[PDB]
Symmetry: C3
Subunit: 350 residues, 3 copies
């Protein structure tokens, strides 16, 4: 199946140039796009690859189009990237399948929409709810009192337990565990007394969660992910974590128990955040940041040493292992003082 240029321009409220009747199989990169492909050009950094590209038509900005005169077909928009983002869904493989496969094992007390798809070997517990147009891909399981709203996607090998409540348009990818028993252990006798985790999880609308994630239920109360939170693969959300709306959590972040992260935060890959902390709205964290105390104000925060060639690096960590011995500041202040008694004596004897 194919889509006409003008039909796509319309979807992104973008100005068409050339022939709109042109049909495309797909969107494609500037390098591998044939004439049956639409492509995008995100600022002048892509110009050269664009110029020599064999794509049929080009999503561009007005300024960029002028610099692309050997080409005939365009969609002109303010944000070429966002326009691209919109159009991908046109060409995304959609699931229209409906109903329940007979390999499935659902409790009779469950409410399952007529417009929902329940895949093969799916197991659904007591008083569960699955809303309109939601997909539950094969093998997945919903424990008792798990609710899932409408237009969700739940991929295979997903464990939803601890009575979790999922709102609408929630997308949960494979091998992810939602609302499993969190890491609650009380120290005694040099042994560890397990704590049975008795709260749940509340995931808001428009949340995406990657694969191989663990979003633990609350010890008491709730693990909450507000609306529009996005979470990449291999992330740990510990018990009673609360993530504010529209926050983005990159792959391999870990957030320890009882921790609050504000709205509109951006955490880069492999960040770690200790337990029982508060992180303000509009906080950004670059790669491999470890956070041990509250961040009380908006901004960008970092930790780490960056990359060094091996020899340089070794020289530097020795210099660090020496650093606590070397009185830095004191040395500088003793200089100032020596500078002072020089300054004076040079003018006093003059």
């Amino acid at each position: 199946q194919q889509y006409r240029l003008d039909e796509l321009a319309h979807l992104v409220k973008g100005e068409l140039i050339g022939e709109g009747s042109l049909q495309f199989s797909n969107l494609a990169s500037l390098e591998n796009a044939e004439v049956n492909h639409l492509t995008f050009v995100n600022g002048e950094k892509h110009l050269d690859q664009a110029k020599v590209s064999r794509a049929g038509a080009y999503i561009v900005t007005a300024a960029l189009k002028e610099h692309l005169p050997e080409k005939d077909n365009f969609i002109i928009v303010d944000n070429p990237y966002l326009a691209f983002a919109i159009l991908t869904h046109v060409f995304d493989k959609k699931i229209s399948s409906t109903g329940i496969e007979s390999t499935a094992r659902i409790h009779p007390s469950a409410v399952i929409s007529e417009t929902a798809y329940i895949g093969h070997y799916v197991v659904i517990g007591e008083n569960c709810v699955v809303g309109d147009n939601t997909v539950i891909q094969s093998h997945t399981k919903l424990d008792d009192n798990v609710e899932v709203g409408k237009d969700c996607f739940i991929d295979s090998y997903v464990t939803i337990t601890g009575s979790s409540k999922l709102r609408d348009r929630v997308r949960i990818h494979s091998s992810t565990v939602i609302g499993g028993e969190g890491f609650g252990f009380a120290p005694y006798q040099g042994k560890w007394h397990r704590i049975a985790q008795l709260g749940s999880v509340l995931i808001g609308n428009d949340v995406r969660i990657g694969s191989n994630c663990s979003i633990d239920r609350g010890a008491l109360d709730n693990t909450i992910l507000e609306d529009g939170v996005i979470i990449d693969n291999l992330v740990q959300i510990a018990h009673n974590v609360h993530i504010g709306s529209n926050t983005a959590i990159a792959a391999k972040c870990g957030i320890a128990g009882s921790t609050k992260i504000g709205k509109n935060c951006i955490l880069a890959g492999a960040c770690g955040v200790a337990g029982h902390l508060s992180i303000a709205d509009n906080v950004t964290l670059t790669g491999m940041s470890m956070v041990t105390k509250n961040i009380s104000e908006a901004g960008t925060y970092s930790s780490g040493t960056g990359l060094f060639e091996n020899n340089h690096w070794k020289k530097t960590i020795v210099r660090l292992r020496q650093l606590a011995d070397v009185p830095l500041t004191q040395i500088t202040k003793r200089l100032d003082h020596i500078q002072a008694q020089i300054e004076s004596l040079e003018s006093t004897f003059n």
Copy 2:
């Protein structure tokens, strides 16, 4: 929900009762959300303000902390509120009394399954496997040949236990974990890597917890060993032949490289990385995201990392780090010594 008299609850934790012991409670609950029919706890002076504002009917607290709750009537006095609470959470837990073998379970005729075990839908169990008394093996999970699971164990969905792994009693393993999988055994030669097949196993002791999306690899020949009481959080990597001593806790996202020994009662925070062929002594604590590349022979708390900087301050600091190597760092208390010596005479 079923209720309990406050005196029963105090007795179960061997605590002191203050208030009317015939008052019944329906649940535990947080300081924030607790209601008149709930029991809560306060652990440290840091939760006192919250407690003061709490609607909770009764307070698990400490003799000292009780002094600061004048407006509150009902107490259980204990040395450690956390533990007391820990003990009581199981009384209010949704307790799974189910037994039998689901109809969709494929079980080899040589497997021995206790009549008080539960086996979920779509479980697979190989030749010569033992499932012990009161053990729950949830749906879709598989137990390859020669795997053994002791008594009062819990194994969740999408779990793989292969490598003929043996599990003792009260073992708790969470969803989509792989136990006994082939470890990372590869030989370098002339710019190629050559796979070596791994032929040892996994031994898991009594009272071991392992979280979701964990990977506990089998040993190469000898074993990966987790001693009694080890607790492991989500997304942890335990390589081939790693040995972890009793009661050691491993927080989320740690990685232990192959053939590393970890002592008794160690504590590693989240996202630590410990290299291969290392020894770590009993009673070692590692703070979040710490890296270990050498043996640690003495007990204690260790740490790596810069701490957090605001980005712009951070950048200027790494400018300085990159410079550190070129500065004669230790030679300069010596040069200042020399400079002050030639003012001394002047």
Copy 3:
């Protein structure tokens, strides 16, 4: 149950046999665990204690070490006992004997499965799928539409293969792993994120090993690529459009961000993070927890980290590190120089 003759075993390792070449063996085992029906080995003198008292029926050894084992009868003599062990592991490695398709599998009729393939219980296989000769697909796994697997592949349980990923030959994918799933594509607009559907796929080359609990995402456009001979340990993130060159090794807990290219024969230690849109040359080694945010264009060895400190010594060092920016460390020797200057230029 499965047995091999001593002499067959000596042949495989190009070894020389002392004792009876008709004796059969069930397994390889350690000196301490080994029984009469098991073969073991000795590398170096250290382990002759365990060897002497081992119940093993046969001993892969060197000719020098055999002399320190008088009470034993059956040996395979070789140059490197460990290397010989290594070869034989594959012989004793429990391989799926069965062949064909379990009745519980659900397969779209447009799939093409070899008769020598094993398709396990509760496997789901979508449209236009292919499964090559001798390939094992263990129970509970699914191949989504248009996915292909080559010959001699091992594909364990609870694996997702989607984004119509293409797998060449002798590919091993361990349990609970996700191949070709939707990458992390989000366009920022006025605070919110617009999800970007992910339209390309995954190309996995021959002799690739991928561990358990890994995520290798599909391409946004084009393909995420693992070139032939790449090995990846457990719990690793490979983002969209990542391209990993020939025979590169990626240790546990590594994360590689979107559209990064990694050269041939690179080695990455545990818990490395590589940022997006980067190139890393052939022959670059990264030590534990390395932080890459720029292209690495020369082969060599690179690194991040402070070193491990005792906690209190740690606290003292970071306090010092915190004040480092407010310190003209560069001018200190020229300040000491200058200070000693106007000391010398004072006397007259």
